[PDB]
Amino acid sequence: ISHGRVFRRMGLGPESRIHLLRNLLTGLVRHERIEAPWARVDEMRGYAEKLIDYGKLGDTNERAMRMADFWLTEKDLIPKLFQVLAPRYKDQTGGYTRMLQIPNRSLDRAKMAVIEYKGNCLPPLPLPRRDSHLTLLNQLLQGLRQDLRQSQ
Amino acid sequence: AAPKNRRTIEVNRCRRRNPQKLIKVKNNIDVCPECGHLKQKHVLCAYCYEKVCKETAEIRRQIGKQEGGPFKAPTIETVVLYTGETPSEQDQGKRIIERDRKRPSWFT
Amino acid sequence: ISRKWEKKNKIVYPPQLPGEPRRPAEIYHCRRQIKYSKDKMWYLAKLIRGMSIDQALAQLEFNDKKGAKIIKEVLLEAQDMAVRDHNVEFRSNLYIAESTSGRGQCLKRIRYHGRGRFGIMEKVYCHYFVKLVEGPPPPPEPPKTAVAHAKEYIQQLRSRTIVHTL
Amino acid sequence: TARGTPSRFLASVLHNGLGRYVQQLQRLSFSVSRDGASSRGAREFVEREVIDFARRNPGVVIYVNSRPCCVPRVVAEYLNGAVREESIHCKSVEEISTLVQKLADQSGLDVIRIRKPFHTDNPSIQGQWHPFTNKPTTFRGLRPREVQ
Amino acid sequence: SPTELTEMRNDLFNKEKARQLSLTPRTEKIEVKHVGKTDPGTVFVMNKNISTPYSCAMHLSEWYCRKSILALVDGQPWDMYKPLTKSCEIKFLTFKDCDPGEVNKAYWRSCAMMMGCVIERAFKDEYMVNLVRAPEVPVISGAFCYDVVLDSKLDEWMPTKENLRSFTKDAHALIYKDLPFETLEVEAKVALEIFQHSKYKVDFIEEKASQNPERIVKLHRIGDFIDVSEGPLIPRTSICFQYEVSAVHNLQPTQPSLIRRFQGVSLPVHLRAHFTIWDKLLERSRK
Amino acid sequence: SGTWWDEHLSEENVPFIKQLVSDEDKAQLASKLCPLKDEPWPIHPWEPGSFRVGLIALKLGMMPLWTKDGQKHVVTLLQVQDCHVLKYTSKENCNGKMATLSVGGKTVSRFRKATSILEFYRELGLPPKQTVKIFNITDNAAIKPGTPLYAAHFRPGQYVDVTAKTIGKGFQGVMKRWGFKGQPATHGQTKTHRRPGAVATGDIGRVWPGTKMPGKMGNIYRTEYGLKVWRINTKHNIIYVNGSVPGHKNCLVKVKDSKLPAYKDLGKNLPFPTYFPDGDEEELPEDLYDENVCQPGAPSITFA
RNA sequence: ACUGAACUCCUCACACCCAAUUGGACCAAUCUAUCACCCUAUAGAAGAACUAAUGUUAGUAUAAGUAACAUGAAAACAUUCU
Ligand SMILES: [Mg+2]
Ligand SMILES: [Mg+2]
Ligand SMILES: [Mg+2]
Ligand SMILES: [Mg+2]
Ligand SMILES: [Mg+2]
Ligand SMILES: [Mg+2]
Ligand SMILES: [Mg+2]
Ligand SMILES: [Mg+2]
Ligand SMILES: [Mg+2]
Ligand SMILES: [Mg+2]
Ligand SMILES: [Mg+2]
Ligand SMILES: [Mg+2]
Ligand SMILES: [Mg+2]
Ligand SMILES: [Mg+2]
Ligand SMILES: [Mg+2]
Ligand SMILES: [Zn+2]
């Protein structure tokens, strides 16, 4: 039974899980876009947003600094978090990362996912887009919307 | 615990040709509007993604070239400029990445 | 070994009379000595048996099995040669008529067990065979209706005779 | 066994003995060797018995081939279009004469299991049994427990 | 009798098609360059008047055959089964495109014509039914409509809910028939010969010939039913999935004659709506 | 090809459609607030032997409750959410012993329901409901479909039966499933700690039907009998039932009158068909308490 | 009263239902003498016939696509991290 269990069991155990996620997160901070197995990415996603929140909390803050020091193995990334990533997202209250499923891995046929920090410099992903408003169904519904607003 | 008797081809066929064993037909397959190659819905188009990844790799090679050695992550934002492009007011005070090719249509 | 499937494309039919329906083009193609189990290959062969060429290619493209890409390659080769050599009008206007796996020539190796004892390991090889036929894929056989069953049962009753009599 | 073998009903070719009896055997081909011990009996048959058989059965055409062969054969053809090949290899004159006469007597119908030892196209004269035979009619044709 | 009229119309249509087919200069070849985002710069070397855009799709893939609704030939809308005439640039238009306006119009017109066919065959022999036209009403309006003149006998008659259901069932039967949308490009005289009986059709053909520099008009056939169209149509009847005949309204200026406007709403297989959304579209289309 | 509702909708059409359908649901629910103003089915007085309809409630959770005697009783909170009568079936039509009322609870999405269910609810003029349960009633207890049901249907001091699917524990071994003692830890016991012992007897060359073996436990319907109603909260439609009911929190439970022979004919004081708020005779307070219940806001109890 | 066998009768036929053992009539294929010449004849010979030896060798099944086996992470694939 695993009712209300929120964390996956991965790696060689709890510490190993932390270390695996830490490496993925370090990769994400450096590269701003990471391919990895879907489950591992999904697990890391939460930590990614939390890290930005601690980044926002301030450079001078000792608590935030300690957290940043732990989660970023490469130390050059710690300035980047506080001075680049945190100021970028100052406007929005969340939804810093974007996760999309990728065609399965060649070797082991693993479910794969791309994770990026929003507003990166890199070429945009081929994101899924909803149908145009000018489609037949959308036209009919626009007609309906117009009729309803005219009624009021 | 060993088999008491050889299982026949009739019984074996029944086991291994069961619908449960069979491969299921997929209804997720649609044409990617951008390239015309087949994509599974809910999944990024393989062709389009490969294209984006190739460009990303090239930019990253250039990033590494400009940085020089490890532990040289900039403390400023980055922008990528292609041939016949100049930094704007926004692009001023950002790290400039130069590419030897033209702007892709999809890159905006 | 036998290689009859190859010789099937070498058949030449006499020219058709004007007052005759157009003969659908048949294409025979196989890959020999695929490093893959025939049993595993069978599932993929069965999958695409009734399908059109494009449907089959789509299904194979998004399959996770090793043999899927091999069948995809064979199908593409067959589609190409169909148009080029066998005078098929449209590359899309093809459907899989036959799709089969057969055993290949195999190699015996030794598998070491956890005493002096051992086992004989067999390196599996298989052939994939395909026949493509020009035209739309034939419609699947409709499920038997209540009226069809009823008719069949009446027919059974009407068929019966007084047995062991004059 | 029956389950392992085809079966047929008892039949005639064209209602053979109804109007007039017509001999079903049509042609009889013999392959005989001039030299060869197998065809010894066959030779003696051709010498003495075949002429008389031909006279007795004018409807049958007899062919005698007389060619080199290890086994002599008789091929019997019937009006229905059946062909029967019978080996007369190392058989006496008596045995061959017997076999040939049997072929003359036989029709072209297959020698398989015959399902019924009788066949009729009009089995009934008074009318085949149905449930309502041997049942009395009722007034107004009223069903049981019917008010009207 | 209606049967003899449709028979005669079919004979004339077939005769005209045969005439147009006969003047082909022995399977001439045309070069058709595909200009699209997908599979760029592919050329089709195809028959001058035998070949169609659908056969171009058949050269590419099944996906093109399935999804393509119209062909844009030299930037002009073109039926999938309409034969090509000259060396040209082709692209395929689907419902999913950024601006599917042309596809929307084509689908709308096609459904209008289908409804026309249905309502023609629907009424009894004793009653007289005369089809006026299919107005070019926008998709945003919510209902494709057709104008019909009925006999004086059914002036006081108003269709019931069951009657509308019956029209719907007939339309679904027509969908199930899976009939191609046959097209013909003719001189006015031929159209006049075909549509000599219906004065409304006469008038409509006259104005259509007038707007064109020549006297060239377009005709479309589903199955034993012929109608003159405003523009290009969808390839096949099977494209429609959800098809209901919404309502019938009497037009207000009924001084000379009484015209019924038949209104209905449709969506293709590609753009299937949920039961709930569909119910909203129905309740709007009745207005 | 597979399709969902918002597959083919635009960016701006999705919020519009959501709003439109939500508003229609709200309107339909609000429409049914006055059943007595609409043409009702005849209301009959209570008779011995009569059985009334029950409810479908959502299990909110548990809190402690105290009594004047000083004993603490844990109670379960059952919230009644959009509970309506859906269908009536006569005894002859049902081919059963009693007339039946189908009652639904907890409104759900229209987009996620089958066409058949959608059509049925469309005819009703109510948004679709998660679960429908059937209550066997007498003819005199018949209620017109569409009529809302409230927590005040039950009254404090009354006993109820509660039926729900139990918490699914998935595949379980004999020790957790049937409380088998298992085998000792040490003193040998090579591979036997949690295993079933002898499954059957030697002489029978088989295993009896219904032997206790490892399998799926939970996720089945169970009934808790003779649970006391301690308190009703009329404002939020809460029933406070004694002890624990089956199922997880936020599940849907079937609540009916107790079938136990002790509480056979205690339905005299209860509102017979149902409670109709629109009647508006002696408007009920926010909270209905049992005599023994220590009400919040009451002075501290002294055992005199 | 009737049913009821391989008993008995009936139409035709007849060597044609015991272990070990014993007597007899035939005979597959091969080689040789002499025949024969789309595959045989009369004789003489003999490594002269396999549903069975946990038989020998080889092939291929069953158990079974089972048991089991394998590559720390990201990435510019420079490198860095655990
Ligand atoms: Mg879980
Ligand atoms: Mg693991
Ligand atoms: Mg060793
Ligand atoms: Mg213990
Ligand atoms: Mg142990
Ligand atoms: Mg041990
Ligand atoms: Mg007897
Ligand atoms: Mg006997
Ligand atoms: Mg006897
Ligand atoms: Mg005897
Ligand atoms: Mg021997
Ligand atoms: Mg043997
Ligand atoms: Mg042996
Ligand atoms: Mg097993
Ligand atoms: Mg394992
Ligand atoms: Zn793409």
UniProtKB/Swiss-Prot annotation, chain A:
Its main location: mitochondrion. InterPro entries: Ribosomal_bL17 (IPR000456), Ribosomal_bL17_sf (IPR036373). Detected in adrenal gland, mammary gland and adipose tissue. GO terms for biological process: mitochondrial translation. Keywords: Mitochondrion, Ribonucleoprotein, Ribosomal protein, Transit peptide. One of its GO terms (molecular function) is structural constituent of ribosome. GO terms for cellular component: mitochondrial inner membrane; mitochondrial large ribosomal subunit; mitochondrion. The keyword Nucleotidyltransferase does not apply. SUPFAM superfamilies: Prokaryotic ribosomal protein L17. It is found in: Mitochondrion. It comes from the Eukaryota. NCBIfam families: L17. Component of the mitochondrial large ribosomal subunit (mt-LSU). Mature mammalian 55S mitochondrial ribosomes consist of a small (28S) and a large (39S) subunit. The 28S small subunit contains a 12S ribosomal RNA (12S mt-rRNA) and 30 different proteins. The 39S large subunit contains a 16S rRNA (16S mt-rRNA), a copy of mitochondrial valine transfer RNA (mt-tRNA(Val)), which plays an integral structural role, and 52 different proteins. Belongs to the bacterial ribosomal protein bL17 family. This is Large ribosomal subunit protein bL17m. The lineage of its organism: Eukaryota, Metazoa, Chordata, Craniata, Vertebrata.
UniProtKB/Swiss-Prot annotation, chain B:
Component of the mitochondrial large ribosomal subunit (mt-LSU). The mitochondrial ribosome (mitoribosome) is a large ribonucleoprotein complex responsible for the synthesis of proteins inside mitochondria. Keywords: Mitochondrion, Ribonucleoprotein, Ribosomal protein, Transit peptide. This is Large ribosomal subunit protein bL32m. Its main location: mitochondrion. It is found in: Mitochondrion. Zn(2+) binds at C32, C35, C45, C48. Belongs to the bacterial ribosomal protein bL32 family. The keyword Ribosomal protein applies. It comes from the Eukaryota. Residues 86-108 are annotated as: Disordered. Component of the mitochondrial large ribosomal subunit (mt-LSU). Mature mammalian 55S mitochondrial ribosomes consist of a small (28S) and a large (39S) subunit. The 28S small subunit contains a 12S ribosomal RNA (12S mt-rRNA) and 30 different proteins. The 39S large subunit contains a 16S rRNA (16S mt-rRNA), a copy of mitochondrial valine transfer RNA (mt-tRNA(Val)), which plays an integral structural role, and 52 different proteins. bL32m has a zinc binding site. GO terms for molecular function: RNA binding; structural constituent of ribosome. GO terms for cellular component: mitochondrial inner membrane; mitochondrial large ribosomal subunit; mitochondrial matrix; mitochondrial ribosome; mitochondrion. The keyword Ribonucleoprotein applies. The chain holds residues 79 to 186 of 188 of the full protein. Residues 91-103 have a biased composition (Basic and acidic residues). GO terms for biological process: mitochondrial translation; translation.
From Swiss-Prot, chain D:
Keywords: Mitochondrion, Ribonucleoprotein, Ribosomal protein, Transit peptide. This is Large ribosomal subunit protein mL43. High relative levels in skeletal muscle and testis. Lower levels of expression in the heart, brain, placenta, lung, liver, kidney, pancreas, spleen, thymus, prostate, ovary, small intestine, colon and leukocytes. Expression is coregulated with TWNK. It comes from the Eukaryota. One of its GO terms (cellular component) is mitochondrion. Component of the mitochondrial large ribosomal subunit (mt-LSU). Mature mammalian 55S mitochondrial ribosomes consist of a small (28S) and a large (39S) subunit. The 28S small subunit contains a 12S ribosomal RNA (12S mt-rRNA) and 30 different proteins. The 39S large subunit contains a 16S rRNA (16S mt-rRNA), a copy of mitochondrial valine transfer RNA (mt-tRNA(Val)), which plays an integral structural role, and 52 different proteins. It comes from Homo sapiens. Belongs to the mitochondrion-specific ribosomal protein mL43 family. GO terms for molecular function: RNA binding; structural constituent of ribosome. One of its GO terms (biological process) is translation. It is found in: Mitochondrion. The chain holds residues 2 to 149 of 215 of the full protein.
UniProtKB/Swiss-Prot annotation, chain F:
One of its GO terms (cellular component) is mitochondrial large ribosomal subunit. The keyword Mitochondrion applies. Disulfide bonds: none annotated. GO terms for biological process: mitochondrial translation; translation. It is found in: Mitochondrion. InterPro entries: Ribosomal_uL3, Ribosomal_uL3_bac/org-type, Ribosomal_uL3_CS, Transl_B-barrel_sf. Keywords: Disease variant, Mitochondrion, Primary mitochondrial disease, Ribonucleoprotein, Ribosomal protein, Transit peptide. GO terms for molecular function: RNA binding; structural constituent of ribosome. Its main location: mitochondrion. Component of the mitochondrial large ribosomal subunit (mt-LSU). Mature mammalian 55S mitochondrial ribosomes consist of a small (28S) and a large (39S) subunit. The 28S small subunit contains a 12S ribosomal RNA (12S mt-rRNA) and 30 different proteins. The 39S large subunit contains a 16S rRNA (16S mt-rRNA), a copy of mitochondrial valine transfer RNA (mt-tRNA(Val)), which plays an integral structural role, and 52 different proteins. Belongs to the universal ribosomal protein uL3 family. NCBIfam families: L3_bact (TIGR03625). It is linked to Combined oxidative phosphorylation deficiency 9: A mitochondrial disease characterized by failure to thrive, poor feeding, hypertrophic cardiomyopathy, hepatomegaly, and psychomotor retardation. Death in infancy has been observed in some cases. This is Large ribosomal subunit protein uL3m. The gene is MRPL3.
